[PDB]
Each structure stands twice: as structure tokens, then as C-alpha cells.
Design a protein around this ligand. Structure first.
Ligand SMILES: CNC(=O)c1c(-c2ccc(F)cc2)oc2cc(N(c3ccc(B(O)O)cc3)S(C)(=O)=O)c(C3CC3)cc12
Length: 548
């Protein structure tokens, strides 16, 4: 079974595409080496098509079926509800792609009679027809990166707006509640970053002689087979469901999730999909369940002892009891052989690690700093190259997703988010008097509208109060940041400290919520520190989900 078949019609853009970093009067203050930053476009879509197109063979053994049966037993305890049209409508992002049938996301959100009527007709059709493949649009994503001695565009596959609202009706409650019940503490999207870090540290310490590894499947969405998507459905069907929900889920599975025709932005047939669609409601939950199933079975095949898995989408980490360096290495090759039999070979082979900090997953690693009292605090960080490249782009261009804001929220304890992103963007917001303006950003795939003035409260909840007083960062973390700054031609950390003092003073001058940002976000910038006191579920990547 080929992941895709192609007609030769091109994957076309829906608008003008920029590959070159836009420059304005603020650009050079952040980043001087402009030619290092680029955006992917549909021009590289052909390259990605080649990468994502391959045959999938699957060999399923008793370990696989044993794990599945256990997963189904837990799924059978879940009771999920149907969302009303209105509930589903309110989960639709304001800027979500408009329907081909004469309405858009704002119409959906307002419960306009044209939108609601069409949605009712799509629902009725799902109930009555379980065979006809549902159309999807295929597009090239425009994403910004730094060059490394260029990545081709990622592809997004999604159905019409009316269908997307129907998916929410049938499955939003399922994808929100089932993964945690089936996978327990292994379901990664249940955690805030602070909770995630705590869970990783505690898990590592729970082993007598800990060993851990990341496993990254090559082109995971393309590795997902018809079997995998039917197995996912069978898990969902274990739930206590409304009869209408059961029918819609079956219909969606047969008609959309298993596969279907691919249409470009110009309406031309591009080919056919027999793998995971990247832009459906079930992408995150389906990938997580499938990765967990295959990985759990593979742990058993490799006889890994006292495994604790952490899984979110296609990202996987296993922490377990070491049997010794030589035996661990052998056991990972067996793990990999099993995963490969299940259709999920790795991009690069997994490596056993005997220090938590040497494991990288979702581009991130655990590092250590110290709070106000000198106590060790663990936090998740990453290489700041991509965040800074996207910050540079967003300095010069308004974009639908404000990666900078998401990065500040999710990487708030990091030296680079605090010193560079907070300083740079608060300066911009001050200049435009836009501190109070809500902005769109992404947390675990779901879209959120967030006012920058609420960052202190948000950071405290996701990371704890220590996120505003961390110091004595590791030499390795400091060196990675500094090295990234030289690479991109970003001013050194000393310059950012100086700018932050100014930004802080400006925020304090404003009083109110602005002053609170000054006090908490920039306490690191001042010599004599002000005493800081407390301030008064699931993943949905590609799921077209919104919250305010
Ligand atoms: C299975 N892997 C893991 O659980 C994660 C490890 C990891 C685990 C073990 C280990 F040893 C090292 C890292 O670190 C993580 C960090 C995050 N975070 C984000 C990562 C990437 C993006 B982005 O490029 O879209 C956004 C958030 S976060 C909020 O904590 O900083 C996540 C989030 C998606 C859920 C998972 C893991």
C-alpha cells in the first residue's frame, strides 16, 4: 500500500509566497544575518512528495494484539458526548479556512443560518453515507527556519469547513478524554511544561539504574496504514457513545481518515492518500495512540524492564531499567526491528542515554538552573535558532500565528526566551501601545487568543513562580545560546540585559498590569531584585481548534 499516488498536477499556493526574510527598521536590532533565514514555499512541494511517498508493509504479532486488547479495555470505561452544532462552532478559529459552499469561519462562529444549515446537511450525509470518499485540500505550509550546512515544505491535508465542524461534533469529547484514560501518565499532552519536567525527573529517579532513549519515526504520518486507522476507530468505538456519534465516527473513518482524493487550491486533482491526514481532528490523538501501541508492543519484544513511556503525537521517549551498556544497545536494535515490522522505522537509530539531560525529544531537552534560594530547578529548553529566526520574520511581518508569544509561554524559564524574546517584543508592543491587544498563538496545536499583559499569570501557572527568578544556568545551555547568537548575528546577551532595563522601567512607568509585567518578567534584569509573590488536557495539532 503506497502512502500516496500522484497525478502530476502541482500543489499550488492560495496566495503570494515569500521565501526571503522581510526587513524593516526593527530587523537589525534583533538579527543581522538575514540571508540565513528563509520560509518554505510550494516550490519545494515536489521534493516533499518524493519523501512522503512509499510502500508500507506491516507484520503484526501477539505483543501488538495484547497491547491493543489492554488499550481497548481502558477505552471501554470512557463515556463521550456529542457536541452540539453551537458548541462545535465556538471551537472554530476565527481565521480558519472558509468553506467552498459560501460561508467562512466567522459565519460559523456567529451561528449564521447558511453555515448552520450546511453543517446540518454535512452531518446528515455522514449518518446516511458510510462509503463515499470525502474531498480534501492539499497545501504546502509556509514555515520559517534557519539554513544549515533548506528543508522542503511540509504538506497539510484537510477537509472542508463543514466537515471540520462535524468532526468536532462526533469526536472532540473523545479526542479530549480518551487518550489520558487509555495511556495514563504516558499521555504527554496532559502536562503543562512544569508538570512534564516534574514527571520526567521523577520517572528517571524511579529507576535503580536508569536508561532512556528518544525514538523518532521517519515521516510518521506516511507510515500510518489503513490497518492503523481502523484500529484507532475500533478503540474509539469502545467508548460509551450516542448512536449518532458511533455512526459519524464510522463514516468519518471510512470516508476521510483512512484516505481519499487530494485537490489543490485551484481545484485540480493531485492524487490520492492512503495514510494519515495531517489536518484532521484525530491527527494528534490517532498518532499518539498508534505510536503508543506500536512502542508498547516493541518494548515487550525487546524485553525492556520497567518501562515508562512518554508519548505525544509521533514523539516518543522510553525510560527504563538498564541491563548494562552492551545489553541495552542490543535491546534497542530489537526495539527498532519491532517498530520497523509495525511500519515505523526510525529516521536515525535510537541511542541509549544514562543522563536525562542528553535525551532530545520535540527539539527539547531537560536542563538545570537555580531559583532565588539556590535550589535546583529543572526546566525544558531547546536550541533557540528556529525561535529566533521566526521572531525575526514576525518583527517585520504580521503572521497568523505569533510563534514568539507561544515560545515565551512554553519556554518562559529559558535564558533565551527571557532575555531576548521578552525584551524584544515588549519593546515593540510599548512602541505601538499594543500591550492590551490580544494575539493569536499556538499551544499543543490548539489556537489561543492571549493578551501579552496576562503573561505573568500564565507563566506562573505553567512553570511556577521560580520561572521569574532562575539564574546560574548551565555552561552548556549558556554556550548553545551564545553560539546561536553569533551564528545568526544577534546581539550578545549583555546588550539584551541593557535593553531589558529600559523595557522594564518603561513598563513600571505605565503602572497597572504593565507594571506587573515589568516587575515579574524582567526581575532578572535588575541588580537589586524585587521580592516576587504569587500573582492574584489534550493535543489538537492540525485539529482546527480555538480557545479564548
Ligand atoms: C515524548 N517527548 C516529550 O514528552 C517532550 C520532551 C522531552 C521528553 C524527555 C526528554 F528526555 C527530553 C525532552 O520535551 C518536550 C517539550 C514539549 N514542549 C514543546 C515542544 C515543541 C513545541 B513546538 O515546536 O510545536 C512546543 C512545545 S514544551 C511546552 O514543554 O516546552 C513537549 C510538548 C508537545 C507536548 C513535549 C516534550
Amino acid at each position: 500500500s503506497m502512502s500516496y499516488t500522484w497525478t502530476g498536477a502541482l500543489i499550488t499556493p492560495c496566495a503570494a509566497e515569500e521565501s526571503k526574510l522581510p526587513i524593516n527598521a526593527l530587523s537589525n536590532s534583533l538579527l543581522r544575518h538575514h540571508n540565513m533565514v528563509y520560509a518554505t514555499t510550494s516550490r519545494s512541494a515536489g521534493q516533499r512528495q518524493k519523501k512522503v511517498t512509499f510502500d508500507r508493509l506491516q507484520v503484526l504479532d501477539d505483543h501488538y494484539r495484547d497491547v491493543l486488547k489492554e488499550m481497548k479495555a481502558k477505552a471501554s470505561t470512557v463515556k463521550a458526548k456529542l457536541l452540539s452544532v453551537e458548541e462545535a462552532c465556538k471551537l472554530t478559529p476565527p481565521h480558519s479556512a472558509k468553506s467552498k459552499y459560501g460561508y467562512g469561519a466567522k459565519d460559523v462562529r456567529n451561528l449564521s443560518s447558511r453555515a448552520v444549515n450546511h453543517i446540518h446537511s454535512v452531518w446528515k450525509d455522514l449518518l446516511e453515507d458510510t462509503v463515499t470518499p470525502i474531498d480534501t485540500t492539499i497545501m504546502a505550509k509556509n514555515e520559517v527556519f534557519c539554513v544549515q550546512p533548506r528543508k522542503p515544505a511540509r504538506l497539510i491535508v484537510f477537509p472542508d469547513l463543514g466537515v471540520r465542524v462535524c468532526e468536532k461534533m462526533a469526536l472532540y469529547d473523545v479526542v479530549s478524554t480518551l487518550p489520558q484514560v487509555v495511556m495514563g501518565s504516558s499521555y504527554g499532552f496532559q502536562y503543562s511544561p512544569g508538570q512534564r519536567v516534574e514527571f520526567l525527573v521523577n520517572t528517571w529517579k524511579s529507576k535503580k539504574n536508569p536508561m532512556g532513549f528518544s525514538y523518532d519515526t521517519r515521516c510518521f504520518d506516511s507510515t500510518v496504514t489503513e490497518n492503523d486507522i481502523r484500529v484507532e476507530e475500533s478503540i474509539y468505538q469502545c467508548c460509551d457513545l450516542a448512536p449518532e456519534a458511533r455512526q459519524a465516527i464510522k463514516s468519518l473513518t471510512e470516508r476521510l481518515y483512512i484516505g481519499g482524493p487530494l485537490t489543490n487550491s485551484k481545484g485540480q486533482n493531485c492524487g490520492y492518500r492512503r495514510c494519515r491526514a495531517s489536518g484532521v481532528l484525530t491527527t494528534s490523538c490517532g498518532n499518539t495512540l498508534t505510536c503508543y501501541l506500536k512502542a508498547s508492543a516493541a518494548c515487550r519484544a525487546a524485553k525492556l524492564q520497567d518501562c515508562t513511556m512518554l508519548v505525544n503525537g509521533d514523539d516518543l521517549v522510553v525510560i527504563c531499567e538498564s541491563a548494562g551498556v552492551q545489553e541495552d544497545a542490543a535491546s534497542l536494535r530489537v526495539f527498532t526491528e519491532a517498530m520497523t515490522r509495525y511500519s515505523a522505522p526510525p529516521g536515525d537509530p535510537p541511542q541509549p542515554e544514562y543522563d536525562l539531560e542528553l535525551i532530545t525529544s520535540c527539539s527539547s531537552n531537560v536542563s538545570v538552573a537555580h531559583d532565588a534560594s539556590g535550589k535546583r530547578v529543572y526546566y525544558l529548553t531547546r536550541d533557540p535558532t528556529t525561535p529566533l529566526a521566526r521572531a525575526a520574520w514576525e518583527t517585520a511581518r504580521h503572521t497568523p500565528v505569533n510563534s514568539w508569544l507561544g515560545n515565551i509561554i512554553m519556554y518562559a524559564p529559558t535564558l533565551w526566551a527571557r532575555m531576548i524574546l521578552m525584551t524584544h517584543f515588549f519593546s515593540i508592543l510599548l512602541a505601538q501601545e499594543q500591550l492590551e491587544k490580544a494575539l493569536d498563538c499556538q499551544i499543543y496545536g490548539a489556537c489561543y487568543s492571549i493578551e501579552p499583559l496576562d503573561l505573568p499569570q500564565i507563566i506562573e501557572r505553567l512553570h511556577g513562580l521560580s520561572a521569574f527568578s532562575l539564574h546560574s544556568y548551565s555552561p552548556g545551555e549558556i554556550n548553545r545560546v551564545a553560539s546561536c547568537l553569533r551564528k545568526l548575528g544577534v546581539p550578545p546577551l549583555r546588550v539584551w540585559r541593557h535593553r531589558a532595563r529600559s523595557v522594564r522601567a518603561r513598563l513600571l512607568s505605565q503602572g497597572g498590569r504593565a507594571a506587573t509585567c515589568g516587575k515579574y518578567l524582567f526581575n532578572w534584569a535588575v541588580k537589586t531584585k524585587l521580592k516576587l509573590t504569587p500573582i492574584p488536557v489534550a493535543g489538537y495539532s492540525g485539529g482546527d481548534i480555538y480557545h479564548s
